[PDB]
Design a protein around this ligand. Structure first.
Ligand code: N17
Length: 341
């Protein structure tokens, strides 16, 4: 029996106890989150900087354990340069009795779009960033995984504006500025283009420095959205499965739509055209990621070779299962043992 597996040391990070393999040195607090915390560290085998997320009591309930397992599997499955992935995964535990937590090792990302937002970007920087976003989205979408909560805080960037999508595939009055109207209002069934709406919202915010859509409640956010999209016509209205929402729309002053040239008076024609095609209420007309990648806005950067798809769909399998915390610990433990970098 052991206290922790050999080649592990104990060190305080941000005033909590961490247990790390010897190969990871110089841990430095990065952030504390809702289900874990993150430090940066150096892999002395190569001197590369990595992020390490310590899961916080993942085995306190079945909900917590399923969540932790899902994050592990989603990170393991995706292999794309614009989608954050798994470099390593470990636990200091030597047994199931000793198994209390585990750690995920990922490439270190300096910051994210939320921290460098607020300000107006050059259209070339917007081109590069949004192109990377759409490549990552095309990949996870091709694996059958949607994000559903894409926002600037979910888009990590390093100093060279290399971008990785975070937190893919996961009440009160939480902010929903970047969520698609069909998600907020559940007035028709959604598809993968829910993320494309978010891209539009983010791109607009880069062009203007101002958040496109806010509002204290869902009705106010809808009013702000219709200011931009215009009140939709009968073709869209017929697709609503919410009869009260349909009646509400048909009873509004029928305000026409766009001149996104007028809405975004400093954007290029290609930027405004792409925004027009992403900020589209009709979920069957809104661009997919793959279609948006073909748009003239990305011509200076476009490389179809980089626009890869996942070779296999994301496949779990236990996603519907209702198991005990002990069984979830068994499966997670197996996955950690079987990992290979
Ligand atoms: C609860 C849940 C989470 N997930 C999930 C799924 C897929 C990816 C991530 C994720 O990006 N996680 C992640 C993001 C940022 C992290 O922190 C950094 C900080 C700096 N550089 C790199 C990573 C660590 C983990 C999380 C599914 N269910």
């Amino acid at each position: 029996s052991l206290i922790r597996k050999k080649g592990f040391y104990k060190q305080d990070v941000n005033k909590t106890a961490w247990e790390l393999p010897k190969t990871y040195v110089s841990p430095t607090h990065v952030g504390s989150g809702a289900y874990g915390s993150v430090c940066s560290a150096i892999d002395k085998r190569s001197g590369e900087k990595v992020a390490i997320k310590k899961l916080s009591r993942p085995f306190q309930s079945e909900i917590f354990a399923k969540r932790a397992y899902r994050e592990l599997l989603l990170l393991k499955h995706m292999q794309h340069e614009n989608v954050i992935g798994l470099l390593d995964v470990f636990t200091p535990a030597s047994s199931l009795r000793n198994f209390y937590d585990f750690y995920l090792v990922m490439p270190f990302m300096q910051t994210d779009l939320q921290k460098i937002m607020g300000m107006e970007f050059s259209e070339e920087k917007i081109q590069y960033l949004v192109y990377q976003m759409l490549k990552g989205l095309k990949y996870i979408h091709s694996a059958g995984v949607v994000h559903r909560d894409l926002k600037p805080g979910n888009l990590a960037v390093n100093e060279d504006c290399e971008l990785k999508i975070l937190d893919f595939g996961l009440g009160y009055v939480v902010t929903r500025w970047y969520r698609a109207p069909e998600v907020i209002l559940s007035w028709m069934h959604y598809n993968q283009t829910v993320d494309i709406w978010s891209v539009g919202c983010i791109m607009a915010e880069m062009l203007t420095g101002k958040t496109l859509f806010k509002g204290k409640d869902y009705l106010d956010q809808l009013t702000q959205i219709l200011k931009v999209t215009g009140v939709p016509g009968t073709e869209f209205v017929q697709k609503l499965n919410d009869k009260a929402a349909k009646s509400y729309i048909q009873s509004l002053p029928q305000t026409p739509r766009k001149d996104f040239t007028q809405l975004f008076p400093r954007a290029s024609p290609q930027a405004a055209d792409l925004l027009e095609k992403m900020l589209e209420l009709d979920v069957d007309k809104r661009l997919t990621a793959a279609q948006a990648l073909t748009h003239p806005f990305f011509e200076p950067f476009r490389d179809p070779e980089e626009e890869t798809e996942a070779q296999q769909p994301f496949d779990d399998s236990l996603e519907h299962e209702k198991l005990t915390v002990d069984e979830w610990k068994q499966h997670i433990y197996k996955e950690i043992v079987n990992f290979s970098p």
